[PDB]
Amino acid sequence: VRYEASLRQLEQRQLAKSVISRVQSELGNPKFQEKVLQQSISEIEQLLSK
Amino acid sequence: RSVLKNTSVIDKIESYVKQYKPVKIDASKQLQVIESFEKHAMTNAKETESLVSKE
Amino acid sequence: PTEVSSILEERIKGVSDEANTGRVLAVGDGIARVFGLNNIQAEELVEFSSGVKGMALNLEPGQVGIVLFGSDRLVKEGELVKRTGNIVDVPVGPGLLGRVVDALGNPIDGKGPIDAAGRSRAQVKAPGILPRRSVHEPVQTGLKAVDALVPIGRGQRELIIGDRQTGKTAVALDTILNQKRWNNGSDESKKLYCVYVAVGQKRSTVAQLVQTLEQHDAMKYSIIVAATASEAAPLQYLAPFTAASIGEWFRDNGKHALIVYDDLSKQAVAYRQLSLLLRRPPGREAYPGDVFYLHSRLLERAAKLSEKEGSGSLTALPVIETQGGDVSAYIPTNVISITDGQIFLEAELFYKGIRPAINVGLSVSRVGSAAQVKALKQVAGSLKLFLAQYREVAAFAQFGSDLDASTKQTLVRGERLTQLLKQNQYSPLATEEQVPLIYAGVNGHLDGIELSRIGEFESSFLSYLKSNHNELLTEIREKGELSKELLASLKSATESFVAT
Numbered sequence: 378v379r380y381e382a383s384l385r386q387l388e389q390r391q392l393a394k395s396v397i398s399r400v401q402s403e404l405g406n407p408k409f410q411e412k413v414l415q416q417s418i419s420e421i422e423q424l425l426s427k
Numbered sequence: 428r429s430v431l432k433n434t435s436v437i438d439k440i441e442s443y444v445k446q447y448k449p450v451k452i453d454a455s456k457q458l459q460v461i462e463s464f465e466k467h468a469m470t471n472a473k474e475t476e477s478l479v480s481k482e
Numbered sequence: 483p484t485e486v487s488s489i490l491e492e493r494i495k496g497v498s499d500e501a502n503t504g505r506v507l508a509v510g511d512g513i514a515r516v517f518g519l520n521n522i523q524a525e526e527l528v529e530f531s532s533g534v535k536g537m538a539l540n541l542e543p544g545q546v547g548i549v550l551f552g553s554d555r556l557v558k559e560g561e562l563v564k565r566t567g568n569i570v571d572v573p574v575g576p577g578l579l580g581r582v583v584d585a586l587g588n589p590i591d592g593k594g595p596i597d598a599a600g601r602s603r604a605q606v607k608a609p610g611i612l613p614r615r616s617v618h619e620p621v622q623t624g625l626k627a628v629d630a631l632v633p634i635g636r637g638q639r640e641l642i643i644g645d646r647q648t649g650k651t652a653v654a655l656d657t658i659l660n661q662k663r664w665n666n667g668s669d670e671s672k673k674l675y676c677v678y679v680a681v682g683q684k685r686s687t688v689a690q691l692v693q694t695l696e697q698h699d700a701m702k703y704s705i706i707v708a709a710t711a712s713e714a715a716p717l718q719y720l721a722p723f724t725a726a727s728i729g730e731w732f733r734d735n736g737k738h739a740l741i742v743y744d745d746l747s748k749q750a751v752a753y754r755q756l757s758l759l760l761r762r763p764p765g766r767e768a769y770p771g772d773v774f775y776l777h778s779r780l781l782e783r784a785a786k787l788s789e790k791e792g793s794g795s796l797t798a799l800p801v802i803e804t805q806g807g808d809v810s811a812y813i814p815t816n817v818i819s820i821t822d823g824q825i826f827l828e829a830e831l832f833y834k835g836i837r838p839a840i841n842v843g844l845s846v847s848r849v850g851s852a853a854q855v856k857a858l859k860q861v862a863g864s865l866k867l868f869l870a871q872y873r874e875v876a877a878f879a880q881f882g883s884d885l886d887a888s889t890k891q892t893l894v895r896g897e898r899l900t901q902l903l904k905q906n907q908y909s910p911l912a913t914e915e916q917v918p919l920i921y922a923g924v925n926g927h928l929d930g931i932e933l934s935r936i937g938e939f940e941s942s943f944l945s946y947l948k949s950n951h952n953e954l955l956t957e958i959r960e961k962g963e964l965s966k967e968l969l970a971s972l973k974s975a976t977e978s979f980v981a982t
């Protein structure tokens with residue numbers, strides 16, 4: 378059970394590290410969809426509180 | 428059974444340990460103390476029936 | 483089960499969707515001065531942009547003074563600081579049982595998320611004059627010397643004080659171990675859950691300890707709360723309060739907890755550290771002015787609730803470390819007068835073979851017999867006073883001038899009584915094991931037996947009583963009170979055996 382738990386935890390940690398690296402690389406590849414979504418989110422939030 | 432790595436190994440060991448197995452035991456064939464009990468009563472306890480009773 | 487990594491990624495997907503304060507002025511030595519945080523509460527929690535949490539303690543006019551829960555390498559001038567909107571608080575409920583948590587109640591064992599029935603604050607008003615009762619239940623430690631001489635009660639606060647390396651922790655531990663007797667049962671109202679607070683201890687030493695708790699299947703009913711040596715001064719200072727709440731849950735809910743504060747001398751060392759660095763001007767031995775208030779408010783939180791309030795108790799065994807036997811130093815003095823009595827352990831006693839090295843002369847329980855078991859009470863009639871008279875005659879013995887039949891008499895008994903209270907670590911005794919021992923000593927059946935042999939008397943006696951007169955042992959236990967005939971059977975039973 379200790380070996381099965383250690384393997385599952387190692388696999389989850391390795392997968393999380395690979396996902397983190399992919400997310401960081403995508404943001405550095407000038408994302409046009411990220412820039413347009415950041416301006417629209419700010420306007421919607423300020424109109425719901427006023 | 429669900430934590431072990433190899434398939435059908437805990438299940439097989441469980442079944443054989445819950446059946447029967449040898450143990451360090453004996454039988455009442457070697458009755459050394461039972462045979463001596465009759466002889467000891469017949470020489471020590473029966474001697475009082477004729478020595479102590481006469482006195 | 484079937485790609486377990488995919489279930490954790492789908493549940494932590496959408497979370498950050500509604501998160502749109504002060505700046506740091508200077509930071510050093512666990513402290514951060516901070517311009518802003520205008521709506522902040524005294525004693526409120528704040529997150530720094532870097533991650534590390536902190537607590538606001540000095541809301542001054544220009545700025546706020548914050549003690550950190552972390553290291554500070556990670557905090558820089560100008561870094562944005564954030565309001566939580568909460569005062570420091572903990573998870574509570576029986577979910578904590580078995581767990582090793584830090585001051586804020588985070589698992590540090592490795593066993594995953596705490597399940598709590600709710601959350602208390604770290605500082606909570608002690609129950610008033612109004613909702614309480616007399617302490618009348620024993621908290622049986624299974625320590626001969628303690629359970630006959632300084633009997634502790636469900637609800638009472640009882641100081642364990644002595645020098646370093648005297649056996650302070652050992653007394654506390656042996657108490658916890660004992661509760662097995664009742665915790666593996668099903669009668670919830672005879673149970674005693676333990677909370678052990680590690681303050682300023684090194685980690686391995688908390689380890690070495692939870693191991694022993696487990697070696698004794700004692701961990702299932704304990705909660706260790708750890709503020710080890712390396713943690714932030716604020717966590718150390720806080721632990722006892724957070725802990726008090728964890729076990730306040732039990733008291734409030736009809737059950738009985740036991741809180742061991744090991745040890746307050748360090749909590750005060752740390753509380754001194756917040757203050758000197760927050761620059762609050764110092765008291766005696768550089769402590770803050772209200773270092774007394776510090777402990778008083780914690781220790782008052784232990785109490786035995788009234789029937790209307792559920793009859794729950796919380797019982798406190800604080801520990802305090804002295805130097806050079808001096809009890810007249812600041813902190814010990816403070817706590818000594820706060821608690822319902824003390825157990826003094828002494829190094830001299832130790833090395834000449836009295837272990838527990840309890841000092842009968844100085845140890846008291848102010849509740850007294852109210853919390854002793856009736857049976858133990860009955861055969862312990864006068865023992866503690868007698869043991870005093872014994873030291874008396876033993877001091878006069880130093881004159882080495884001839885003794886009479888009265889002094890030699892009480893010397894023989896006191897020596898044997900002394901010896902009869904010695905006890906090995908990790909071996910708490912049932913009441914019915916204790917009772918006949920005490921009875922044999924008191925009524926002087928031990929008085930014609932070699933001193934080195936009283937060791938063997940004890941176990942050889944108990945062995946025989948279990949074997950033969952088990953019917954007594956089980957009555958003592960079930961009834962807790964030696965009826966007149968039971969004194970008879972016991973009287974007979976002892977004489978019998980002393981003639982080998």
Ligand SMILES: Nc1ncnc2c1ncn2[C@@H]1O[C@H](COP(=O)(O)OP(=O)(O)NP(=O)(O)O)[C@@H](O)[C@H]1O
Nearest residue numbers: 645646647648649650651652653837838905906907
């Ligand atoms: N009844 C006992 N018999 C033999 N040794 C004991 C007994 N009680 C305590 N000790 C020993 O004495 C040593 C120190 O005891 P301890 O219980 O840590 O006292 P302490 O005041 O907590 N010391 P510390 O807190 O580390 O300054 C331990 O190694 C124990 O084994």
Ligand SMILES: [Mg+2]
Nearest residue numbers: 650651652744
């Ligand atoms: Mg200790």
